[PDB]
Amino acid sequence: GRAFGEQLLKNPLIEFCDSVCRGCGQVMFQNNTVTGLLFFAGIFYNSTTLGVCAVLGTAASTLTAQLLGVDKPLVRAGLFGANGTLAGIALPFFFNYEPAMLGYVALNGAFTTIIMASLLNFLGKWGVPALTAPFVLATWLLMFGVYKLSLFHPGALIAPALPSVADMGTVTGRTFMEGLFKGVGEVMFQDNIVTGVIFVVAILVNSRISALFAVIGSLVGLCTALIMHSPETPVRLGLYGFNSVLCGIAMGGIFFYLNIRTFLYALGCMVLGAIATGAFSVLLSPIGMPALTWPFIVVTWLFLFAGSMFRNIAQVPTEKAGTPEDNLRSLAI
Amino acid sequence: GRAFGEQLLKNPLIEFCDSVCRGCGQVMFQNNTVTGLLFFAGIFYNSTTLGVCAVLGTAASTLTAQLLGVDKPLVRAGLFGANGTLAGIALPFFFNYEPAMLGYVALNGAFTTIIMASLLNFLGKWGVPALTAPFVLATWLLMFGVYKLSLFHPGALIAPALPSVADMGTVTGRTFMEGLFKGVGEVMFQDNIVTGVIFVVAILVNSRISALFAVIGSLVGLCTALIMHSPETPVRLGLYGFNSVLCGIAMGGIFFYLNIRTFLYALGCMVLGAIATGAFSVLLSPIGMPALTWPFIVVTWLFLFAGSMFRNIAQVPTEKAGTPEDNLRSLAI
Amino acid sequence: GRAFGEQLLKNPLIEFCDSVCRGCGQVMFQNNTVTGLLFFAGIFYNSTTLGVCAVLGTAASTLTAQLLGVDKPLVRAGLFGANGTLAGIALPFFFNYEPAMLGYVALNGAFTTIIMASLLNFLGKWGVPALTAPFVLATWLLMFGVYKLSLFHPGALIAPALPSVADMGTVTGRTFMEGLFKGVGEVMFQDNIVTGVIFVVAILVNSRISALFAVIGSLVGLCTALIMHSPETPVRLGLYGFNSVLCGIAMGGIFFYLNIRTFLYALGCMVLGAIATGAFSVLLSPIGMPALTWPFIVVTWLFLFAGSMFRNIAQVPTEKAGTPEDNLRSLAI
Ligand SMILES: [Au+]
Ligand SMILES: [Au+]
Ligand SMILES: [Au+]
Ligand SMILES: [Au+]
Ligand SMILES: [Au+]
Ligand SMILES: [Au+]
Ligand SMILES: [Au+]
Ligand SMILES: [Au+]
Ligand SMILES: [Au+]
Ligand SMILES: [Au+]
Ligand SMILES: [Au+]
Ligand SMILES: [Au+]
Ligand SMILES: [Au+]
Ligand SMILES: [Au+]
Ligand SMILES: [Au+]
Ligand SMILES: [Au+]
Ligand SMILES: [Au+]
Ligand SMILES: [Au+]
Ligand SMILES: [Au+]
Ligand SMILES: [Au+]
Ligand SMILES: [Au+]
Ligand SMILES: [Au+]
Ligand SMILES: [Au+]
Ligand SMILES: [Au+]
Ligand SMILES: [Au+]
Ligand SMILES: [Au+]
Ligand SMILES: [Au+]
């Protein structure tokens, strides 16, 4: 609710970065300039290069939408920036630096908006959001072929093997302290406790409810994995949190009106997001590749598509969907 | 066509088991209380534990739909029970017993109805039924991650390997006798001739035509596999029947009006269901996992979606679709 | 624009081969009798057996549509022939001859039209074409199971392995000369320079623009692969051209109105088609199977679905879509 006159002051370059500011927030569904800025802050706190590659992905994807002529409202809301952000981080997270790295980030960001547009047209038939699938599909397509096209070289995180039952480690208070905040950091490939805290503060600025569901998701994803007898190391590193962080955020009052029934619904989703993390990890291990946020995407899509069938689960028209605070105030209109 | 007064006698607990009775029948698309009861009978004849785990899956999935508030008509028809039934059997069929087994069956049953609702909303745009895909997707998601989450331990049926050409065995009269009825038993993971016979009698009670297509499907799936030079062992064990049993049933006058053209159409589908069994078996072998009824699902979806394009193949509006006897009597309205 | 009286001369057997003539052209989206004839010519120039197996697939698929009762206009345009053509070549390209080869080609052709009908009904909701996906899905289903059903034996091109980084070879003028025309030949599994030239002449007969985009696609797919540091051998053999040939053709003024913006759009697609070739090749290597034209299909579907979102990219209503020359003349109506 800013003064309408402030628009006399808009030049297209400050309009562009506002798109970038919010694009980044929309990685965790927060349509908020400051949230995104603070996301950047947190990534930059962990690494300068991932910081620039996050910005370039966001910039590359947002620009591509404008060049292609996406409706200005979609572009202004950050929906064509979120997946670019992740496309820019994932690539130097998984591959060793080569000069061509930046060009490839540009390509991957550019590709995300093609796919964002694809999914919005496809899923639009059911009012289901595209979530972060543009980044997963683009990045898989650009990463899988690395054994056949040697421009980049895979980092040691990528190692083809048949799955098998492998030791177990030891749960300590640290397992919990570190798993929690890295769970949140790992939403954007940030192996860093402080970054994760920064990310919660960043969400908190836009919404207390979403910040709380981000914390809960991470805890739910974490203890689901221990209940399921994961080795301690993946769990301390937030590997079983971050899909559930995203579940927590999206289910926890953004796409459904927060109440006691929608809350239990969101709990179901956070748990299955952790279990699905094991599932796609295994499915992709013969080619050594990361499932990324596909466990969040599949589970969440499942719960979103089911919504219109369940009368005790109150769905938000996606056209409308704002923060959980705003959705409840709106329902009282 | 029961007296309407009989509803003065309905208490919610007898309403619940009627849902469970029919849920189970709907594993082979038979909206029939007695059929389901006899399915239970047959499973129980083979094993008491698979019997209870079948009931708990059915109970867990049906309850979840009611808790979530699915339209009472959908719940009363067993559509939210069929996939729960299978989710409850598959888990102790493939994994060794651990105390947590029952909770996990509850979880898996619960998950099926989420997915049932998902698919009904998605596929509803084309009037295409969800078949048994809720169970396949839920169970894959809950099974694949077992190498990474060690709560359960995979049975010896699960063994990651690269595919290769492997001896051939010897076809005998027994190959046929046993392959036929285990083909039907294996629709519900019942390695048992008597169970299979029980299952045919169970279908027969509701529909002679469906019982006949279940027999034919099994034979078609069986000899397709020999024509294709399968080793004798998978074929005697009904492994190449049961996807074709399901094809036979669904195509054979439930979703299409039985005539000479629809019959040949159903033959096409039963054959490709056998070939697809080899296909998904291979696709999933690097991670050692069962395709389950995915070969039936893909092929059948293909033929169902094609239906509205082929004018010589008379489709049933899925809203209406009852037994093959009732569909023909209805067409004569 | 032939005299309408010429239809007094039509007997159903000459109507049938006209369907076969155009079916074959429609493998590269050319609704043109002579183009298809010349495609046949070119295949036959390379091999007599692939020639007959191309015709039988085309014949088997086209007949199945007529037997099933597809709208005569769809059948007359070759849309139910293109995928049959490829189903007939792929099978003896990848498997050693066995007597049953021809029956299987008939089966595979027959299956393509089921899937053509499936996809047309499914994708019809967005006006998106089915491209060559009927052939990929049918052929995968009929090929993957070969390790479990030994009727055919895989040729040495099929060899299950975990991916890994493998020497590099040496780019010469020949890499380019041979890569270019085999890029075009390989659209139909024709490892033959002359065949490829024949194919360009064949397209040229129907459309200069499409013939040019076929050449460009092949070059773009080729140098993308070198930029990406592919070994020289796959590139000289046209393995990185043919998905991009198809991209080039479909994007280059058939499905979008050719202009400076649509051209850059098509460039994006051709590049990602090459990168996706590496991607699906890797994804399917644990089971040793060819991605075929899936890299073209996924990328192209992505750009097609995105179309209606991008206002600077002018889409063709698919109902209407003819050659790029005719689309521009139509836009001037
Ligand atoms: Au800025
Ligand atoms: Au800004
Ligand atoms: Au900014
Ligand atoms: Au900012
Ligand atoms: Au949003
Ligand atoms: Au950078
Ligand atoms: Au970088
Ligand atoms: Au715990
Ligand atoms: Au806990
Ligand atoms: Au009962
Ligand atoms: Au009962
Ligand atoms: Au009952
Ligand atoms: Au009963
Ligand atoms: Au039914
Ligand atoms: Au049990
Ligand atoms: Au059990
Ligand atoms: Au036979
Ligand atoms: Au037979
Ligand atoms: Au002819
Ligand atoms: Au002709
Ligand atoms: Au012809
Ligand atoms: Au011809
Ligand atoms: Au066309
Ligand atoms: Au032949
Ligand atoms: Au042949
Ligand atoms: Au080059
Ligand atoms: Au070049």
Chain breaks in chain B (C to N over 2.5 A) after: 166
Q: Which helix (H) or strand (E) holds A282?
A: helix A260-283
Distances (CA, A) of A118 to B146, C104, C299: 34, 36, 10
Whether residue B117 lies within 8 A of chain C, CB to CB, comes out as no
Do B277 and B187 form a contact (C-beta atoms < 8 A)?
no
Locate the chain B residue with the closest alpha carbon to C283: B283
**C229 to chain A, minimum CA–CA distance in Å?**
5
C147 and B166 within 8 Å at the Cβ level: the answer is yes
Q: Contact B150/A280, CB-based, under 8 Å?
A: no
Of B229, B271, B313, nearest to C151 by CB-CB distance is B229
- Chain B residue closest to C285 (CA)? B162
Place of tokens 């590099």: C168
Determine how many CB atoms are found less than 10 A away from the CB of residue A171: 14
The residues, ordered by sequence, that sit 6+ positions from B130 with a Cβ below 8 Å of its Cβ are B79, B116, B119, B120, B123
Please check whether residue C227 touches B, CB under 8 A: no
How far out from the chain centre does Cα A80 lie? 13
- Residue C18 Cα to ligand 20 midpoint, Å, equals 4
Q: Do A228 and B149 touch (CB under 8 A)?
A: yes
User: B262 at the C interface (CB within 8 A)?
Assistant: no
Which residues pair with residue B95 across a beta bridge? B154
Q: Measured between alpha carbons, how far is C134 from C112 in angstroms, rounded to an integer? A: 5
Please report residues of A whose CB lies closer than 8 A to that of B154. 165
Tell me, in angstroms, the distance from the centre of ligand 16 to residue B92's CA: 5
Burial B165-183 (b: 16+ CB within 10 A, else e): eeeeeeeeeebeebbbbbb
Residue C125 to chain A, least CA–CA distance (Å): 9
| CA–CA dist C132, C243 (Å, integer) | 11
Please answer whether residues C327 and C316 qualify as being in contact, where contact means their C-beta atoms are separated by less than 8 angstroms: yes
Minimal-distance CA residue of chain B relative to C124: B126
3-state SS record for B67-100: HHCCCHHHHHCCCCCHHHHHHHHHHHHHECCCCC
- DSSP letters along B129-156, please? --TTHHHHHHHHHHHGGGGTSTTS-B-T
Residue C243 DSSP SS3: helix
> Measured in angstroms, how far is the CA atom of residue C84 from the centroid of ligand 19?
17
For chain A, after which residues does the C atom lie more than 2.5 Å from the next written residue's N, i.e. where is it broken? 166
Helices A260-283, B101-123: axis angle to 10 degrees equals 100
Instruction: Report the residue count for chain A.
Output: 333
Beta bridge partners of A95: A154
Under a CB-based contact definition with an 8 Å cutoff, are residues A283 and C286 in contact? no
Confirm if C320 and A132 have CB atoms less than 8 A apart: no
Cα nearest neighbour of A305 on chain B: B118
- In angstroms, what separates the C-alpha of C8 from chain B's closest C-alpha? 26
Phi-psi region of B238 (alpha: psi -120 to 50; beta: other; left: phi over 0): left
Our CA angle for C16, C18, C19, nearest 5°, is 65
Resolution (A): 2.7
Which B residues in the span 293-332 are in contact with A, Cβ-Cβ below 8 Å?
none
* Amino acid residing at C36: G
A229: amino acid identity, one letter: H
Q: Write out chain A residues lying below 8 Å of C310, CB-based.
A: 68-70, 117
- Write the DSSP string, C156-211: TT---------------HHHHHHHHHHHHHGGGT---HHHHHHHHHHHHHH-HHHH
Domain that holds residue C34: 1-333
The domain that holds A100 is classified in CATH as 1.10.3430.10
Q: Judge residue B41's burial from the number of C-beta atoms within 10 Å of its C-beta, 0-12 exposed, 13-18 middle, 19 or more buried.
A: middle
3-state secondary structure of C30: coil
Nearest alpha carbon to residue B195 among B206, B205, B183, B207: B183
Q: Is C164 on the interface with A (CB under 8 A)?
A: yes
Strand partners, A315: A256
Q: Could you tell me which residues are beta bridge partners of residue C154?
A: C95
Phi, psi of A292 (to 5 degrees): 60, -135
Burial C84-105 (b: 16+ CB within 10 A, else e): bbbbbbbbbbbbeeeeebbebb
Do residues A255 and A304 lie in contact, with contact meaning Cβ atoms separated by under 8 Å?
yes
CB contact under 8 A, A149 and C311: no
CA distance A216 to A203: 14
Chains within contact range of chain B (3+ C-beta pairs < 8 Å) = A, C
Tokens standing for residue C102: 């021809």
Q: Output the CA A250–ligand 21 centroid distance in Å.
A: 56
Distance C296 CA to ligand 15 centre (A): 48
B65 exposure class (CB count in 10 Å sphere: 0-12, 13-18, 19+)? buried
Contact state of B229 with C149 under an 8 Å Cβ cutoff = yes
Closest CA to B56 of B3, B1, B101, B114: B101
Q: How far is the C-alpha of C74 from the C-alpha of A157, rounded, in Å?
A: 50
Task: Evaluate whether C235 touches C178 at the Cβ level (below 8 Å).
Answer: no
The domain tally of chain B equals: 1
Using a CB-CB cut-off of 8 Å, the residues of chain B touching A163 are 147-148, 160, 287-288
> Are the CB atoms for C324 and C258 separated by under 8 Å?
yes
Tally A–B CB contacts below 8 A.
114
Shortest CA distance to C64 belongs to which of C108, C14, C10? C108
Contact residues on chain A for B111, CB-CB shorter than 8 A: 268, 272
Which among A135, A299, A309, A115 is positioned nearest to A224, based on CA atoms? A299
Name the residue type at position C131.
L
Structure tokens at B259: 């005539």
List chains touching A (3+ CB pairs under 8 A).
B, C
Residue C256 DSSP SS3: strand
C-alpha span between C113 and C103 (Å, rounded): 16
Neighbours of B57 (CB within 10 A): 30
The pair of three-digit structure tokens given for residue B220, joined into one six-digit string: 């078609």
Report CA(B189)–ligand 18 centroid distance (Å): 24
Tokens of B13: 């607990």
Q: Tokens 């954007």, residue?
A: A188
Nearest-Cα residue of chain C relative to residue A101: C228
Tokens of C18: 């006209």
Ligand 5 center to residue A227 CA distance, Å?
32
* Beta carbons of C54 and C85 less than 8 angstroms apart: yes
- Note whether C145 contacts B229, CB cutoff 8 Å: no
Q: What single letter denotes the amino acid at residue C232?
A: E
Tell me which amino acid residue A169 is: G
Find the C95 Cα to ligand 21 centroid distance in Å: 27
CA dist., res. C210 & res. C201, Å (int): 11
